[PDB]
Each structure stands twice: as C-alpha cells, then as structure tokens.
Amino acid sequence: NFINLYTVKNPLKCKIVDKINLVRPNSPNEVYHLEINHNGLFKYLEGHTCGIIPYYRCARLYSISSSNNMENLSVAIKIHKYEQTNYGYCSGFIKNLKINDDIYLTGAHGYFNLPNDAIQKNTNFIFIATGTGISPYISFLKKLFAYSNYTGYITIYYGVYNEDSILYLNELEYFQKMYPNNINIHYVFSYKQNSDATSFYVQDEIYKRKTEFLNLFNNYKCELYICGLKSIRYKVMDILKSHDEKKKKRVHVEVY
Amino acid sequence: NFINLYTVKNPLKCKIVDKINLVRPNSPNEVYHLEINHNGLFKYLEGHTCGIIPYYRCARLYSISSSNNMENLSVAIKIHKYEQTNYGYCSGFIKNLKINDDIYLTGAHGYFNLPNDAIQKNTNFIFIATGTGISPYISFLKKLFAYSNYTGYITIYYGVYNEDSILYLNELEYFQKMYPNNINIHYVFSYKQNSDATSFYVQDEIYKRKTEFLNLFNNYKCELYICGLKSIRYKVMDILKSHDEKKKKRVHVEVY
Numbered sequence A, B: 001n002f003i004n005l006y007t008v009k010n011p012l013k014c015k016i017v018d019k020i021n022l023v024r025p026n027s028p029n030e031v032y033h034l035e036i037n038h039n040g041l042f043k044y045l046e047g048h049t050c051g052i053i054p055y056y057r058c059a060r061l062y063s064i065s066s067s068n069n070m071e072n073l074s075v076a077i078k079i080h081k082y083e084q085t086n087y088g089y090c091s092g093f094i095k096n097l098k099i100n101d102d103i104y105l106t107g108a109h110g111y112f113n114l115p116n117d118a119i120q121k122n123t124n125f126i127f128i129a130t131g132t133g134i135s136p137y138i139s140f141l142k143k144l145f146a147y148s149n150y151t152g153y154i155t156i157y158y159g160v161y162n163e164d165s166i167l168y169l170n171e172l173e174y175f176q177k178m179y180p181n182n183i184n185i186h187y188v189f190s191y192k193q194n195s196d197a198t199s200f201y202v203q204d205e206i207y208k209r210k211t212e213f214l215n216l217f218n219n220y221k222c223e224l225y226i227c228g229l230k231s232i233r234y235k236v237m238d239i240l241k242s243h244d245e246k247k248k249k250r251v252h253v254e255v256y
C-alpha cells in the first residue's frame, strides 16, 4: 500500500535536520541517529524500512525508528569499516553528511509490521534484537503506547558490545520506567565486536531464561520478532526447535 | 597492480561461452559455473574476485575459479532466493543469462592471494571453505600444481549441504587422486540450508580433528585461508584462539 511508493527512478527528496551520535564514549561502534524531514510526504507503517540512495545509484535499507504521527521520520545507521580505516559505500556518505543536506529516499519497504489488531487484542510480544535491530522495536513502542490503551506484555532481549553501545537507551529507559508492568528488558553485553559472537551471548541469555521465554511464547501466545543480525536468527530458532507448530505464524524475521 | 583496472565507469565487455549447473540433482542449491571470454583482456592473480554489473549499475563480486594461463576466466554463482520464489538482484540476472550474451566486468578486486614464494618455498596450506568459498581454492590448486614442482602439503575443510552440493567436485577429485601425498580433503555435510548451521558443522569437524589441524598450523607453518561464509570466520578463529602469535601473519580471510 505504501510499499515502493518511492523508487530509485522517482525518489523522495528530503532534508537532514539532526545528526546525533547514538552511543556513549566507551562504545567501539560509531552510530548516528538521523532526523529526516520529508514534509509529511514519506508514507510508512511502524516496522518499515526506507532506502537511502548514497550520492544522489545503489540504495541501502534502514529501519525507521520514529512512529507515524511524528512530523519527521528517523533512522539509526552504524558506520561500517572496513570495506570488503576504509568505509562502506553508504557509511562513508552518511559519515560526511551534515545537517540540512539533501537526502533521497525510496520506500516504504518490508513486512516487519505489527499485527493490525495489536492494541485491540492486547497482543503480547517478544522482541529480539542485536545492534541496530532495536530500531523497529522503538517505533513499535511509540505506536503501541500511543507515544496508552494497550495493556499487553512485552519482553525484549537486546545484545550489544557493552552498556555504552545500547542504541536508543533513553527511549528504552523511558518506556520501562513508564510502563513497568508491561515492559521487561534483558540487556546482553558481549564485549566482542564480531557479530557471530554477539549472537552466542544472546542465545546463551535466552538459554538461561528458557523457562520464562517458553512460558511467554507458548502460554501467553506471544508474537515473536527477530532483528536484525544475520547470525541471530538460527541460534534463537534453535531454542524453539529443540523444545517445541503451524505457528510458526508468530515468528517474524528481519535480519541482515 | 591489476587492481581496479576495470571499474563501473570503464567496464570490460565480455561474452558468456558456457553456463553449467555445478550441483547434482539432490542438491537444494542452484549454482552455475560461467565460462567467460574476456579476449585475454581481464587481468588477475589467483584468489582475485571480479565484479559483474547486472543489466549493463551496482556490481557484485565473484571469486574467479580459473587460473591465469587458462584462455577464459571462470566464476561460480549461487542463485539467491529470496530477496530481503523471488530472486536476488544479480542472481535474477544470472538466472536468465544465456550463452553468448554480453557481460560486463570490473576488477580485479581483493587480496586473497597466495604468497609470491609459494612454489619455491613449498609452503604448506590449510584451506577452509563453505559453499562457493571453494572457488579461489580451485584456482590456487591449478596454479600451485601448474595446471608440478610444488611439493608442499595442502589440507582442505569444505562444508556443504550434502554430497551433491560439493562445487567443483570433479576438479577436487582430480587433484586428490593425482597428488595423494600433497592433498587431504575433509568434506563436511550439514543438511541445513541455513549458513550459520553449516559453520557449526565445519567447526565441529575441525574440533574432532584438532590434533592434526594444530599440528599442521603450528608445526608445519601453514598459511591458513578462510572462505567465504561470514559465519565461518569466528568459529574457526575460536579454535585457534582457545588453544594457541604475531602470526597472525598466516591467517587470510575473504568472507561474505
């Protein structure tokens, strides 16, 4: 419906209003929050991605971390070094972007959305994420909490290098303090810059909490979301497989 | 030296002479060997990759599986489904390619090469690969064996879905039967289409053969190569880390 309204042949011209570092000084990562002005012209549901065309033409996708009723949209971008120091194609472009610079978007893209009944049915959720995979969850929280008549339970597993590497820490803390009876967040730190290692640490933590995890999934009929690390998918699916199924209708995946 | 002689602005126009399926019928993968005629104009060392521009403009890299003194060059391409059934960008283009069709190349790219002294010093090798990561090793074997005065020892660990998924099986069997005192090949089958799972099976096998593996690496001063799976790197490095170092000069990596 909003899908591929803007493409590489007709991209949506936008403006950068804000560019802020998302990590604290002890993080080895370099990550930027981008505040993008689209004049209310970019159309999306929470969970969608947008394509950025560097140097506007080969677009890269980024999960939108803002919600629908926010004027601007937002995005969280890790700076990739080094190209397989040196910079990745879109990373180098983002690195040198300044506020008020033009930026061209394609989209919306993807199907990593909430079920349409979410607020009415009070659906329960498990969100699993590593690194920038938190983005779509922040946008889910803003929508679900009407950021207020959603009374379901949400559990988040989030793996990162260390404390200072937690993206959107402010939003997460806000939501947990604000709705302590609806939100439980389990942080996992790896202290390994390698992503395959990080997904071991997250699998291990779900492992250690297998009892609550399976209680939530089987008994509370959770919708389970996995994002965005490639090496996180199988390792989590392996905990459900080795214990539990046509649903298999509540697993949602967006990895890269 | 041969690096980026051809780029996206000035690509090398070539012709497809052969396109053959590399896997046998019991393989779930779809993979094509491509025989490319470059009129001796494309310059490369063994271990290099070449960029293919689909629809000639966003290029993808493919390890060259032929050797220098072969008239044509060759490449092995897995068909990626489905885009994150549907097809990946370059995959769809390769899928519909016919013999004698024009194809445009950039390169050469990369640094996954043999040490220049290889044949003189009789350097020993460990090659680790999954799926299409065998490509550069096939080209190493052709060069090293002058495909004949190389008398070093080579050990290969190669993980794939099943027997019918072994790429370049003919070449591998040729080289092992031909030089039984120089080549040892350890096949690993996962029966899992997921790549993270496959890398577990390969780690497990190196595990089981830790004694020979570490004997070859430490005592025979092997040059160690890892290709090409992303999830294979850490898992193998973890076997060297947990047991052993400024060399750390013999580890070579090309993953994706």
Ligand SMILES: Cc1cc2nc3c(=O)[nH]c(=O)nc-3n(C[C@H](O)[C@H](O)[C@H](O)COP(=O)(O)OP(=O)(O)OC[C@H]3O[C@@H](n4cnc5c(N)ncnc54)[C@H](O)[C@@H]3O)c2cc1C
Pocket (backbone or CB within 6 Å): A049, A060, A061, A062, A063, A064, A076, A077, A078, A079, A080, A082, A083, A084, A087, A088, A089, A090, A091, A092, A110, A132, A133, A135, A228, A254, A255, A256, B059, B060, B061, B084, B255, B256
């Ligand atoms: C659905 C989705 C959502 C995403 N959301 C986010 C997000 O919210 N935040 C975020 O930071 N990232 C996100 N990503 C990933 C994002 O697109 C990365 O920024 C991007 O993948 C890296 O692009 P780059 O230009 O920085 O690096 P690139 O230049 O693309 O290089 C990165 C890697 O791609 C491979 N590569 C490089 N060149 C080639 C080539 N020529 N051919 C084949 N392979 C090559 C190499 O492995 C290299 O290490 C998302 C990805 C997807 C699919």
Ligand SMILES: Cc1cc2nc3c(=O)[nH]c(=O)nc-3n(C[C@H](O)[C@H](O)[C@H](O)COP(=O)(O)OP(=O)(O)OC[C@H]3O[C@@H](n4cnc5c(N)ncnc54)[C@H](O)[C@@H]3O)c2cc1C
Pocket (backbone or CB within 6 Å): A059, A060, A061, A084, A255, A256, B049, B060, B061, B062, B063, B064, B076, B077, B078, B079, B080, B082, B083, B084, B087, B088, B089, B090, B091, B092, B110, B132, B133, B135, B228, B254, B255, B256
């Ligand atoms: C050094 C090197 C050597 C390689 N050698 C080989 C080889 O010998 N044989 C071989 O088969 N492959 C090889 N590859 C990988 C090869 O480039 C793949 O064919 C390619 O990565 C997939 O391209 P595609 O167009 O088929 O799929 P794509 O359309 O690129 O999609 C593949 C994946 O990229 C991500 N993606 C898709 N769209 C976007 C987007 N807009 N933004 C960000 N991410 C996106 C998704 O995760 C998707 O699943 C090599 C890669 C490298 C880096």
